[PDB]
Symmetry: C3
Subunit: 32 residues, 3 copies
């Protein structure tokens, strides 16, 4: 239970950090 969740949360958190860097870079292109 606990462990499984913990795994799945660090992965999603991992993904999230990247997703944000991408969106930040998308914002730059398009226009500020």
């Amino acid at each position: 239970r606990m462990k499984q969740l913990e795994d799945k949360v660090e992965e999603l958190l991992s993904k999230q950090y990247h997703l944000e860097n991408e969106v930040a870079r998308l914002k730059k292109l398009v226009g500020e």
Copy 2:
């Protein structure tokens, strides 16, 4: 309380996948 959690992570998993999809797509369409 653990099923609860499974439930919110369940939600986050899904929303993350549709987000990434949207972003990848946008990245493509936008271009430089």
Copy 3:
């Protein structure tokens, strides 16, 4: 070890809301 998990589910939940917001706009801002 429970509060930690709970506290992480919130970072993800929090960032998730903001990112969907960011992309939703860029979408309209691109026509997409």
